[PDB]
């Protein structure tokens with residue numbers, strides 16, 4: 001049977017014509033998450049409820065509905081149930097959901113549950129905004145210069161999970177086919193050799209870049225940068241870059257700037273010129289440290305987006321406070337972006353900032369911008385007050401050490 | 416015919432039993448490089464000659480021999496000669512060589528000439544040391560904490576150059592084979608889809624990691640860190656990690672630290688315990704900013720090494736002064752690690768620091784440690800004197816602006 005309880009009071013969010021219809025009493029599924037999920041999720045629930053309560057004076061209220069994935073799912077549904085079918089059904093049915101960090105088992109041939117959720121629900125946009133909160137300790141001199149939004153492709157690239165183990169019958173079969181049927185001469189050592197496949201498609205690329213450009217338009221951003229390693233991977237990474245520029249030209253009236261290759265796209269709402277440009281991935285990892293102010297919206301493939309989002313989070317001292325969304329055409333899943341940190345689980349110690357800012361993204365996605373703004377306001381005030389969790393406090397002079405739950409309260413206090 | 420002139424005075428370096436036999440008058444092939452190669456290469460030649468002259472009081476002298484690759488090769492050997500066979504022969508024959516940056520053409524289906532040199536000569540180690548020079552402007556607060564040596568695998572990974580263009584007959588053929596014969600269900604969009612292949616082998620992994628560990632032993636370093644994304648790419652990146660730890664156990668008496676997974680390897684020369692450990696790639700890009708002091712020698716695959724070496728160079732304000740070597744069992748090629756920057760070519764403007772420090776690596780590789788030490792000493796003094804090229808000067812208060820050639824002289828002045 002199902003162990004999920006549909007809330008008595010509460011109504012389902014619907015989708016008509018690519019627009020969400022959010023009732024005053026939306027049911028929002030949430031996954032508590034394993035490890036420190038037990039610490040950060042309740043802090044998130046309280047902070048969100050408070051922002052919603054304050055923003056709309058009791059007129060609106062989320063009906064939270066617990067659903068399962070990860071270690072907790074095995075405890076609820078039994079031994080080998082890490083990702084129950086009903087969880088996929090419920091996220092699609094209720095349109096908007098949030099999760100803590102997840103335990104994926106090792107030794108049982110199971111692939112990342114985070115990636116499973118993204119792929120099964122076709123949540124092809126991994127959306128990671130990275131900004132600086134004044135007062136956050138940072139290893140760089142000018143973290144305030146970083147204000148970027150990463151659009152990471154979620155459905156393709158080496159993340160597809162297509163690979164075969166060295167010395168397996170399947171690997172030999174693939175290698176045999178490549179060498180004998182495809183005439184491949186470039187495998188340096190064809191014995192005891194693992195093999196992985198990297199796909200990149202026009203449709204996959206264009207739906208991702210389309211979203212990145214519409215976002216820049218909607219939020220009056222200054223540029224979209226395609227980041228790629230196309231000089232070495234001509235037909236995957238290079239094709240991503242070419243398809244990206246082509247989409248700009250074909251759907252958004254992009255026009256050559258000078259002799260190229262950059263394009264200008266006219267914001268139909270503000271008349272601002274949005275620059276469409278590109279940077280090679282290795283150079284980009286240097287540019288985000290050396291010239292962060294020159295970058296805004298980023299569009300890139302799965303693996304590059306993984307690396308870029310994490311490298312940027314570290315700049316802004318945001319390793320434990322980086323928000324994230326996974327968005328598709330039919331539903332969306334917001335998430336803590338850190339791991340399960342089991343050594344601290346239950347100690348009410350870790351930073352709930354990441355999952356709280358993903359909840360800020362969730363509220364904004366719902367059109368509840370007022371409540372979202374209150375969360376941003378609360379976060380800004382609490383950090384500026386130097387009333388923070390251990391991860392910040394240990395890097396600061398004369399700050400005040402707060403528990404996880406207490407930092408949640410400090411956010412509410414600063415709304 | 417050949418347009419290379421073998422120097423009248425000078426003798427060939429030989430190799431016996433994995434040990435270089437370097438005469439007092441070694442012939443060293445060099446490739447000038449395109450674009451700013453014309454600026455940085457002569458500065459390198461002068462600085463090296465001066466260090467060698469001073470170190471050994473005229474007893475030793477390099478006989479430089481120009482050889483060709485890139486744009487200059489087409490001017491010397493004709494239209495489509497970007498990489499003449501003789502260049503590969505000469506680098507292998509003379510054992511040690513150095514190059515400026517290279518022009519690879521676009522639009523002619525030619526792959527990276529840098530990668531061509533590495534693969535054709537089986538230079539399977541890309542060696543990139545990253546340290547801080549006092550006085551260098553840096554975007555981070557504590558660049559002095561960064562002192563790492565990157566061992567980047569050079570012969571495998573997606574760099575192999577194995578891929579087919581979307582909509583090509585070959586791509587369809589591969590995709591057909593994967594779906595129908597291999598039962599692949601994970602290609603999200605199989606139409607208009609480019610495909611690349613990622614190989615990783617036991618032999619490829621182990622020769623790279625073996626070198627990294629022998630280096631840590633020889634240079635009394637504190638740890639070797641395997642960096643990988645093995646949680647997503649189990650059979651390539653994950654296999655690299657497993658093979659790395661296994662090599663440590665099997666060849667260097669690595670023993671479990673606590674419950675693992677880290678190992679300790681006893682330095683047979685100093686008795687120091689070298690830690691063998693591992694970090695996931697996205698987290699590692701955060702750790703190099705947040706905990707740089709915890710890292711020393713790094714061993715990783717081709718693409719990850721590309722990104723890591725560049726991200727680290729940016730930390731230490733070393734984007735134009737990062738040295739690099741490509742080392743195999745039979746020869747070695749030292750290189751400027753920046754591009755050709757054609758907008759400045761011939762202006763005697765850019766930083767020759769990168770190619771000069773690669774020449775420092777070359778001299779050290781030759782066993783000429785005294786001359787190498789003089790280059791390090793000169794570089795340290797010149798930068799500390801704030802007498803530097805435009806790339807440093809523009810980031811500094813009250814420094815003195817020097818031309819490329821003049822910075823070369825300043826290095827000599829500080830020896």
Ligand SMILES: NC(=S)c1ccc[n+]([C@@H]2O[C@H](COP(=O)([O-])OP(=O)(O)OC[C@H]3O[C@@H](n4cnc5c(N)ncnc54)[C@H](OP(=O)(O)O)[C@@H]3O)[C@@H](O)[C@H]2O)c1
Pocket residue numbers: 036101102103104105106114319320337338339340341342350351352353354391646695
């Ligand atoms: N099979 C599983 S579950 C698996 C395995 C590997 C990777 N991953 C994935 O890779 C990512 C990293 O996970 P992981 O397991 O390797 O890292 P974790 O062990 O979960 O966390 C590593 C460290 O990050 C810091 N940290 C994490 N969350 C924090 C918070 N909210 N506040 C303050 N500090 C925090 C803590 O650092 P300090 O100890 O220094 O304070 C913690 O010890 C996650 O997305 C995870 O899903 C998953």
Ligand SMILES: NC(=S)c1ccc[n+]([C@@H]2O[C@H](COP(=O)([O-])OP(=O)(O)OC[C@H]3O[C@@H](n4cnc5c(N)ncnc54)[C@H](OP(=O)(O)O)[C@@H]3O)[C@@H](O)[C@H]2O)c1
Pocket residue numbers: 231280451516517518519520521529734735752753754755756757765766767768769806
């Ligand atoms: N087909 C070819 S040749 C190709 C194409 C793409 C990439 N690549 C490879 O990718 C890497 C980057 O090359 P690229 O062509 O994209 O970059 P480049 O145009 O060669 O250089 C880009 C910028 O880097 C800075 N720079 C480079 N060398 C410097 C030095 N010695 N001193 C001071 N500043 C320096 C300059 O920045 P500022 O203008 O700000 O002062 C320069 O404008 C190279 O390894 C290259 O081989 C090659």
Ligand SMILES: [Ca+2]
Pocket residue numbers: 306307310697
């Ligand atoms: Ca990540």
Ligand SMILES: [Ca+2]
Pocket residue numbers: 282721722725
């Ligand atoms: Ca590079």
